[PDB]
Motif scaffolding. Structure first.
Motif, PDB file in Angstrom:
ATOM      1  N   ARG A   1       0.802  -1.665  -0.505  1.00 19.10           N
ATOM      2  CA  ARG A   1      -0.041  -0.063   0.272  1.00 19.10           C
ATOM      3  C   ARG A   1       1.309   1.380   0.103  1.00 19.10           C
ATOM      4  O   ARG A   1       1.242   1.092   0.969  1.00 19.10           O
ATOM      5  CB  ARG A   1      -0.930  -0.340   0.642  1.00 19.10           C
ATOM      6  N   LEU A   2       0.795   2.416  -0.453  1.00 22.40           N
ATOM      7  CA  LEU A   2       1.205   4.185  -1.043  1.00 22.40           C
ATOM      8  C   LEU A   2       2.508   3.226  -1.906  1.00 22.40           C
ATOM      9  O   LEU A   2       2.880   4.359  -2.565  1.00 22.40           O
ATOM     10  CB  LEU A   2       1.836   4.162   0.147  1.00 22.40           C
TER      11      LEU A   2
ATOM     12  N   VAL B   1      -0.251   1.682  -4.959  1.00 27.02           N
ATOM     13  CA  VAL B   1      -1.575   0.933  -4.801  1.00 27.02           C
ATOM     14  C   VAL B   1      -2.309   1.078  -3.605  1.00 27.02           C
ATOM     15  O   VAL B   1      -1.618   1.735  -2.231  1.00 27.02           O
ATOM     16  CB  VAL B   1       0.053   0.318  -4.065  1.00 27.02           C
ATOM     17  N   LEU B   2      -3.526   0.880  -3.565  1.00 31.21           N
ATOM     18  CA  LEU B   2      -4.363   0.550  -2.984  1.00 31.21           C
ATOM     19  C   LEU B   2      -4.702  -0.721  -1.904  1.00 31.21           C
ATOM     20  O   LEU B   2      -5.260  -0.611  -0.456  1.00 31.21           O
ATOM     21  CB  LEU B   2      -5.493   0.974  -3.651  1.00 31.21           C
TER      22      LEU B   2
ATOM     23  N   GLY C   1      -2.347  -4.118  -1.329  1.00 29.29           N
ATOM     24  CA  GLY C   1      -0.598  -4.760  -1.327  1.00 29.29           C
ATOM     25  C   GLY C   1      -1.156  -6.704  -1.971  1.00 29.29           C
ATOM     26  O   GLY C   1      -1.887  -7.327  -2.094  1.00 29.29           O
TER      27      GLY C   1
ATOM     28  N   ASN D   1      -3.921  -7.474  -5.738  1.00 29.15           N
ATOM     29  CA  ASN D   1      -3.388  -6.295  -5.405  1.00 29.15           C
ATOM     30  C   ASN D   1      -3.935  -5.327  -5.991  1.00 29.15           C
ATOM     31  O   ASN D   1      -5.438  -5.745  -6.841  1.00 29.15           O
ATOM     32  CB  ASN D   1      -2.172  -6.606  -7.197  1.00 29.15           C
ATOM     33  N   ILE D   2      -4.895  -4.072  -5.886  1.00 33.32           N
ATOM     34  CA  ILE D   2      -5.412  -3.400  -6.502  1.00 33.32           C
ATOM     35  C   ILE D   2      -4.854  -2.021  -6.591  1.00 33.32           C
ATOM     36  O   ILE D   2      -3.588  -1.873  -5.708  1.00 33.32           O
ATOM     37  CB  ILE D   2      -6.695  -2.722  -5.230  1.00 33.32           C
ATOM     38  N   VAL D   3      -4.433  -1.450  -7.579  1.00 33.45           N
ATOM     39  CA  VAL D   3      -3.996   0.323  -7.741  1.00 33.45           C
ATOM     40  C   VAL D   3      -4.934   0.816  -8.069  1.00 33.45           C
ATOM     41  O   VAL D   3      -5.986   0.590  -8.671  1.00 33.45           O
ATOM     42  CB  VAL D   3      -2.567  -0.933  -8.301  1.00 33.45           C
TER      43      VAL D   3
END
Ligand SMILES: [O-][O-]
Ligand SMILES: [Ca+2]
Ligand SMILES: [Ca+2]
Ligand SMILES: [Ca+2]
Ligand SMILES: [Fe+3]
Ligand SMILES: [Fe+3]
Ligand SMILES: [Fe+3]
Ligand SMILES: [Fe+3]
Lengths: 125, 126
Positions: A3-4, A18-19, A21, B15-17
């Motif tokens: 994340r981040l 990234v929201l 991981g 994974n989420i972006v």
């Protein structure tokens, strides 16, 4: 990824944050996207390292001690403030002042900035 | 082709972006195209997922949804995002917390988004 983190595709230019991981490697244009690690590019720190100014009820962030250029082909695409579990992003456009104001309550904060040319940069108070 | 603000997920590793800068190449992960998580397309209880926006002194309070959405370990709202102008404010949440977030901001027009780990991406606007 975590994340981040910010990843960029060096071929087509896609850049993502990234929201959530996971273990898989982000790919674009048939190649692993590049992790844009903060303050790693050989560039003028006085123009890219974010300067955090504490104000009543929040923070003002300007990149960097020297106002960074904000030209069509060379500018700070955005400034971000990381506080606790908050991630505040202020996108910018060429011609604007390379700075942003964030109204938030948090003693410790991390400020990040991205130059389309010189990469990812950060600072903390 | 990715556009700023879009959210993509790898259905394999999770994974989420979110897109910061768009481009031509397609996002891939675990050998498959990442899935564009389009807002308000999943078949779920709208009253539990569509964000409700409430104007407050100096900002907005957003809650998910008109009926408090569950915040369990296997089913919770991962984050709430407020979009206004060139601003994109995100409040990440955790199981056990209230499904809400407060944003101090000056913007007559805002879009609020929320993401459920199970039911996907949702949005509302004032
Ligand atoms: O030079 O930024
Ligand atoms: Ca963000
Ligand atoms: Ca494909
Ligand atoms: Ca495709
Ligand atoms: Fe994956
Ligand atoms: Fe630069
Ligand atoms: Fe690419
Ligand atoms: Fe749900």
């Amino acid at each position: 990824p975590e994340r981040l983190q910010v990843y960029k595709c060096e071929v087509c230019g896609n850049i993502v944050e990234v929201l959530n991981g996971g273990i898989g490697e982000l790919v674009c244009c048939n190649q692993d996207m590049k992790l844009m690690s903060e303050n790693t590019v050989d560039a003028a720190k006085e123009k890219h390292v974010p300067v955090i100014e504490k104000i009543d009820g929040g923070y003002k962030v300007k990149v960097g001690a020297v106002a960074h250029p904000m030209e069509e082909k060379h500018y700070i695409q955005w400034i971000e403030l990381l506080a606790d579990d908050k991630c505040y992003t202020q996108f910018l456009k060429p011609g604007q002042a390379p700075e942003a104001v964030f109204l938030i309550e948090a003693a410790k904060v991390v400020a990040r900035a991205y130059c389309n040319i010189h990469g990812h940069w950060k600072a903390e108070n």
